[model samples]
Target: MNIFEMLRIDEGLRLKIYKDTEGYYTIGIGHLLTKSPSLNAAKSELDKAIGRNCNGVITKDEAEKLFNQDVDAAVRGILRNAKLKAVYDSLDAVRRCALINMVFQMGETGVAGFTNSLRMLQQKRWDEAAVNLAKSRWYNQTPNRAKRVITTFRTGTWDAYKNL
Candidate 1:
């Protein structure tokens, strides 16, 4: 394996934001220390998980690289349906990125719990995947995001949500 790959494997990867063992804001495998303070103002679980209120989000290329590493660790770290990674790997690049993005946001268990959508994916059932995705709590919670992701999965197109 390559150096970054090996480091990611060893240290694990975090894309969004999470706290370390000592409760400090940390980013990727090799960038765990940014000297940011504790998120004392945090009220929600998301804020608490971020462990800070900072705004220096990286670019898409950088984020995607981080996500790739994160996805690798997630696929290797979890114990799910056992065929999860295989099925994940079989998806088109955009769909794969969508799943990885979800995994980064919700963890692999969340990704695995998309039972109907995942099964449709494994069967190469695009319309069924869209149908199942539309029926999900994920969709109910965030319809706009779901429409883009579901359309991407069904059409194998990357719509990046131009306006929102």
Candidate 2:
């Protein structure tokens, strides 16, 4: 099939967003929309469109196409800083995914405040970066998730549940 045909088949049409597997806010074929804005918007927009209170929900099959779109957006958001990008790119896939996940949760601006962590990462000081990563309000807010990410940061190893 042609590219357009493939994409069209892949990105199945969805009327609303649904909680993805493992419970991340996703809508419109696995589009990883942020809960703060994207989630609210997704709910309200579809509500208006269909003239009903439609809670965005997509089944697994319906979400197949959204991974690429979400990843593209996530990667774009993660690469806001050239310096940050350099450090991010130097890491393995596991570390990179962790950073991207943080970016997804914290937003680029919020994650940017992890200056010390980024510096340590850039300096190839994994332990220091992990220490710095744990020293954040975000860590306080999400201790469990933060712990997993920090572990990966410190040990530079992939966790099955946290990392890809």
Candidate 3:
């Protein structure tokens, strides 16, 4: 499956504003409104994208649209990082999606902090990459999601979500 589809499963669709695990104001598919320079600007942008006032609620189509925008930004951010861009180019689609998924959940800078893990990924040392990922606070905070991503990196298959 594509990164968007996988993220829909991992992030879940939320048509209304809610606090995420970290207590950040979020909406749609993990859209961190708090991450914006200002919540007002972020809401205004969302309203424009969905072509409506939104009023703290959006339709499924609107949510998907916002998700696409967010994912596109994540992809661009990944490609802009020279280190990540090199590693990204060497991976297969499935593993690439896993990397994108991580960047979607965390920001590009957050994912970049996994120096050893990224190195392992670049080298195609799947087991080492997975192990390094599991050692992080990100894994501890969201073990199930991290496990699936790690499994994808390890096996290079979409089967990681089979039992979920």
Candidate 4:
């Protein structure tokens, strides 16, 4: 499946604003309105996307637009990292999605901190990379999602998509 479909399942669609696990104001496939540079700007953008003044609710189409923007940003951020970009380029499509998924949840700098895991991934040591990932607080914080991503890294397939 494409990243959009995969992320829709993983992040879950929310038509209304809600607090995320970390209590940030989030909506529409993990879009963190709280993290926006300017909340007013974000609101205006959302209002435009929904074709009206937003009242904390949006249509599926508007949500998809936000999702696409977020995903594109995640991809661009990953590609900007020289080290991560090299490893990403070497991976097949499925494994590439796994990497992008991680970057989507954690910023590029956070993922870049996994030096050993990155090394393993660069070496094509799938199981080692998975093991390294499991050793992180990220895995502890979101065990289910971590398991699926780790499994995808190890198997080099979309097997984890089934669980989503």
Per-candidate TM-scores read 0.54, 0.64, 0.90, 0.88
TM-score of 4: 0.88
- Rank list by TM-score: 3, 4, 2, 1
Candidate 4, residue 153: the lDDT equals 92
For model 1, residues 47-105, the per-residue Cα lDDT tens digits are 33344443533334554465466556755644354757767768876666556545544
Per-residue lDDT, model 2, residue 65, is: 40
Q: Candidate 2 residues 28-116, lDDT tens each? A: 64354545445676667545544556566544443444555555666797677776688788987667766766665566787788887
- Output the number of the lDDT-best candidate: 3
lDDT (0-100) at residue 93 of candidate 1?
65
Task: Answer with 1 or 3, whichever has the higher TM-score.
Answer: 3
Off by over 4 Å in 3: 35-51
Q: Which stretches of candidate 4 lie above 4 Å from their native place?
A: 35-52
Tell me, what's the RMSD of every candidate? 9.6, 7.7, 2.4, 2.8
Q: Tell me which residue pairs clash in candidate 2.
A: 17-27, 17-56, 17-57
Clashing pairs in 3: none
The whole-model lDDT of each prediction reads 0.58, 0.62, 0.86, 0.84
